[PDB]
């Protein structure tokens, strides 16, 4: 699943390349950091 970063991280990468999260490592780590989104209407606001 691709998603929409805010800061460059050694797993996720840039903002908008190809996201390969580990299934929980996002909402327990990333989404508290305010650096990642579970994509709902984000594949075009990313643009």
């Amino acid at each position: 699943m691709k998603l929409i970063l805010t800061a460059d991280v050694d797993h996720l990468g840039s903002i908008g390349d190809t996201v390969e999260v580990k299934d929980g490592y996002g909402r327990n780590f990333l989404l508290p950091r305010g650096l990642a989104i579970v994509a709902s209407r984000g594949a075009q606001k990313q643009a």
């Binding site: 909402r27 327990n28 989404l31 508290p32 305010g34 579970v38």
Partner: protein, 63 residues
């Protein structure tokens, strides 16, 4: 826990534990309840939710 999920309205499930000789006695199936900490938004106080796992992944999502 053996609990019941909050948002999902999920709850236990009864039935039977049928051993080989078919002696069926009552065991209960439980939802997979974890005590997550659910901020309203970034900055809330994340109280506590005995919520299932089918409502950690998708459905309600905070942590």
């Amino acid at each position: 826990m053996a609990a019941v999920c909050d948002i999902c309205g999920k709850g236990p499930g009864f039935g039977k534990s049928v051993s080989h000789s078919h002696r069926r006695t009552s065991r209960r199936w439980d939802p997979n309840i974890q005590t997550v900490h659910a901020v309203t938004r970034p900055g809330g106080n994340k109280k506590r939710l005995n919520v299932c796992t089918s409502c950690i992944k998708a459905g309600k999502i905070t942590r």
